[PDB]
Amino acid sequence: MLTSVLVRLVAWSVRRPIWVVVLSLVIAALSSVYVAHHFKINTDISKLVENDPKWAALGRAIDDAFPQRNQTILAVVEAPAPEFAGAAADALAEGLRRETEAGRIGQVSEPAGGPLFEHDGLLFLPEQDVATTTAQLASARPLINVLAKDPSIAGLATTLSTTLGVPLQSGQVKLSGMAKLLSRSAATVDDVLAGKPAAFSWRALVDADAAREPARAFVTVQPVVNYGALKAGEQASRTIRATAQALKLDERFGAAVRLTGEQPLADEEFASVQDGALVNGIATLAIVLVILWIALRSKRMIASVFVTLFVGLVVTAALGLMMVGSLNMISVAFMVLFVGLGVDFAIQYGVKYREERHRDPNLDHALVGAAHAMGMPLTLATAAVAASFFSFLPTAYRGVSELGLIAGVGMFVALFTTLTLLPALLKLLAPPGFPRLAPVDDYLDHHRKPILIGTLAVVIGALPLLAHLRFDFNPLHLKDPRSESMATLLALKDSPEASVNDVSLLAPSLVAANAAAQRLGALPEVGRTTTLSTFIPDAQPQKLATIAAAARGLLPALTQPAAAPVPDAQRVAALKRASNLLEYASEDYPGPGAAAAKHLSESLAKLAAADAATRERAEHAFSVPLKIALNQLAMLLQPLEITRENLPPQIVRDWIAPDGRALVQISPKVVKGADPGDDAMLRRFAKAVKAAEPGAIGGPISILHSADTIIRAFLQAAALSVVSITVLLWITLRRFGDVLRTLVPLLVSGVVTLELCVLLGMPLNFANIIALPLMLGVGVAFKVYFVMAWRAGQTGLLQSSLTHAVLFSAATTATAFGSLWLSHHPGTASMGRLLALALSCTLIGAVVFQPVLM
């Protein structure tokens, strides 16, 4: 039988000398050589969830048709003013173009609008709005003339004083008509006095009020073609920041460049998972050391068990890397999982050898007897754990599949080690408790029996409170929101320029693509759909005629150059006269916004006191954006017509490049008050679009098929785990009464675990779904330990009981789960906390249900 075969194998290994130990040393050495030969850490996010051939048959079309989009990098510049943002964007674009021309990194693409888009930045609005804006600008011809001709801060103050003296007090213009401008200028001037980097905006006044304080301009670029052995993107991701810092945008424009995309997400994830490894390692080493010292007090044993743990670790790592050369950021937890789980066999053997020492005076006979004694329990625990881990193998989830393979092979290797190597190293180095717990020892075990009528009675009505659980169908949440790489994405949620929530759809032609865009816009929950045709303005002649009629009246008042700055003392006198006028106004002209007039008076009375260089700073912050905005309005006011034969090659290369006809990027409908911070409407949008047109796969919003796949895989894996564990128990406990005993409490404890997870409100996710079968196997192992431990009597678990070994194993597993909890990574922090809660509930569920285990 299994017991006889195993004791014969261990006794035949004993009949082999230290030869076994030196052979284990050589095998561990070559296994470590193989490990260091191929570590190969991978962090792919689309591999750990397999997809059916149908969705892959469209992902491959996405890849083959449009290569410059699946791996692109998006750069974001942030300036306190839109003009500075646009200037920084254009400078970064020309710099990256000069960088690419030499053949170092890929070509750049400017999404906010290319040369024709910037020259024609007025044809993309309805005729009414552009007509009103042009008429408004034409009405303001004298003011824009007297403003642009003297853009100096001194000249600006002078023209403000001259337009504040006679016009206001005349009776044609009220203070409140410009009080908004006055208050904004007062705030900017006060900021300049504070020395902080300030910037005034002239585009937020007359053109449009849709100018927010996080003024962002976006530029994208696809990474290097990877000529040789370059990392394919890291060089460019560094050169972007290098050229940005070299171009000196912090002072010339006062901005900040950011970078984001799947590649920097991967890099920051690599960094986050690697930095929280040394602390986790020292923590698990410390906890296993202290639990081994409290389990056994001897240097002749603890060292040997440490050697067994280390050799088990290295051999399981070698075999795992031999199976698959990747850890996928999820299977990397085996490094701590082995240390936290496989030490149970060693602790069990050590406690039983201590009991044998108390019993058997000899050491060889005591060791072989302790080996033959834990023959069936140890192997059954190993089988249960390995089955619970291998149940996830026939699923679509790849990450958990690899994790289960690694953990099962590691459990087999740990059994082999504890059986063969540990007794040899014991022979070669042949070597009460807690006298305090009496009060609870009296009356906390003798009330374990009515717990059956208390907890079961309070748990029945807890079934309706189980369905209040959500499921995170988007992996982006558990991606360390503290890093900038996705903090930029989180802040980008308001800007609709770069649509991170878009979907895609190909077509057999451009007209078919337009028809699909129309029939998908007919759905009341889509919003807007874009294609190559949407970059073609509708009515060219009328718009061009209106803008030409505005230009023929506005142009001659913009190109005229200014004069030179007068000396400084005259500027002080000008600001003094401006202060006097503004003070007289705010003192004898009270009304709605006279407080703004007093604020400007105070700002202009504190500005011109004794400082010199800060006034040049104020000039840099006032006149430069003014000239930028004026040049922009001048360029944008004499546009051309946009035709497909005149469209830039970059746009047509990004929308319909190949004979693989155009794609139609589709965004989700957004309404005021329903910001994209709501996953329910995104899921409904995805389902609606998928029902309308099936080929609309690829969008980060239509990733619900991944969640469906992983939930089906987890369901089938849990079913297979339960079936395998019960068939093992029944092939070992033939009369089904014992398997009912060993099982029913474990299912009850799993129900309790799910109920606690729903009460706390934490949802299950991609890497937080393995707790149920793992803890089921662990509890089954504990119950099959107990079915042999208390055979002599049902004594409480106090004062170094016969189950103190199992208690120490539980404590070690719990502390290892708590160490895996603190990992500075949500994808593992959630896993750790759920593992800890599951252990905490299933332990008492398998212990206090003693009438249903023996």
Which of 106, 102, 24, 120 shows the shortest CA–CA distance to 72? 106
Residue 766, classified by CB atoms within 10 Å of its CB into exposed (0-12), middle (13-18) or buried (19+), is buried
Tokens 């793992």 correspond to 774
- Residues 638, 668 share a domain: yes
Query: Could you say which of 702, 728, 758 is where a domain stops?
Result: 702
Which of 6, 98, 811, 100 shows the shortest CA–CA distance to 379? 6
Q: Residue 249's domain is classified under what CATH number? A: 3.30.70.600
Question: What are residue 441's phi and psi, to 5 degrees?
Answer: -60, -35
- Residues 663, 622 share a domain: yes
Give the sign of the dihedral formed by CA 776, CA 778, CA 781, CA 785: negative
Q: Which residues partner with 221 through β-bridges?
A: 73, 108
The domain total for the chain is 3
- Residues 93, 126 share a domain: no
Residue 249: other Cβ atoms inside 10 A:
22
Does the residue 484 lie in any domain?
no
Does the residue 265 lie in any domain?
no
Chain breaks in the chain (C to N over 2.5 A) after: 431
Which ranges of 391-537 would DSSP assign to H, the alpha helix?
Answer: 398-428, 438-443, 451-460, 484-491, 510-521
Residue 128, classified by CB atoms within 10 Å of its CB into exposed (0-12), middle (13-18) or buried (19+), is exposed
- Residues 757, 692 share a domain: no
Complete DSSP assignment for 312-371: HHHHHHHHHHHH-S--TTTGGGHHHHHHHHTHHHHHHHHHHHHHHHHH-SSSHHHHHHHH
- CA–CA gap between residue 543 and residue 637 (Å, rounded): 11
Query: Could you say which of 227, 260, 293 is where a domain stops?
Result: 260
Question: What are residue 315's phi and psi, to 5 degrees?
Answer: -70, -40
- Contacts of residue 590, defined as CB under 8 A and 6 or more positions apart, other chains included, come to none
Which of 392, 300, 284 shows the shortest CA–CA distance to 338? 284
- Residues 533, 653 share a domain: yes
Tokens 């906890």 correspond to 287
Q: What is the resolution of this structure in A?
A: 3.6
- CA–CA gap between residue 601 and residue 578 (Å, rounded): 8
- Residues 108, 119 share a domain: no
- Residues 351, 385 share a domain: yes
Which ranges of 761-825 would DSSP assign to H, the alpha helix?
Answer: 771-789, 804-821
Which of 840, 512, 816 shows the shortest CA–CA distance to 663? 512
- Residues 606, 531 share a domain: yes
- CA–CA gap between residue 43 and residue 623 (Å, rounded): 49
Does the residue 479 lie in any domain?
no
Experimental method: cryo-EM
Does the residue 27 lie in any domain?
yes
Which of 747, 738, 757 shows the shortest CA–CA distance to 854? 738
User: Which structural domain, as residue segments, surrounds residue 748?
Assistant: 2-45+271-431+439-472+705-852
Question: What are residue 200's phi and psi, to 5 degrees?
Answer: -90, 150
Q: Tell which phi-psi region holds residue 800, choosing left (phi > 0), alpha (psi between -120 and 50) or beta.
A: left
- Residues 654, 515 share a domain: yes
Write 33-40 long-range contacts (CB < 8 A, 24+).
34/318, 34/321, 34/322, 35/314, 35/317, 35/318, 35/321, 38/321, 38/325, 39/321, 40/321, 40/325, 40/326
- Residues 750, 763 share a domain: yes
Tokens 């208690």 correspond to 807
Which of 91, 399, 76, 90 shows the shortest CA–CA distance to 264? 76
Strand pairing class (215-221; 73-79) = antiparallel
Tokens 């296994």 correspond to 31
Q: Residue 712's domain is classified under what CATH number? A: 1.20.1640.10
Let me know: does 558 contact 633? Beta carbons within 8 Å: yes
- Residues 361, 288 share a domain: yes
- CA–CA gap between residue 590 and residue 174 (Å, rounded): 11
Tokens 């675990």 correspond to 753
Does the residue 626 lie in any domain?
yes
Let me know: does 783 contact 746? Beta carbons within 8 Å: yes
Query: Could you say which of 680, 702, 724 is where a domain stops?
Result: 702
- Residues 698, 682 share a domain: yes
Does the residue 66 lie in any domain?
no
Does the residue 186 lie in any domain?
yes
Does the residue 61 lie in any domain?
no
- Contacts of residue 349, defined as CB under 8 A and 6 or more positions apart, other chains included, come to 370, 371, 374, 418, 422
User: Which 3 state secondary structure label does DSSP give 417?
Assistant: helix
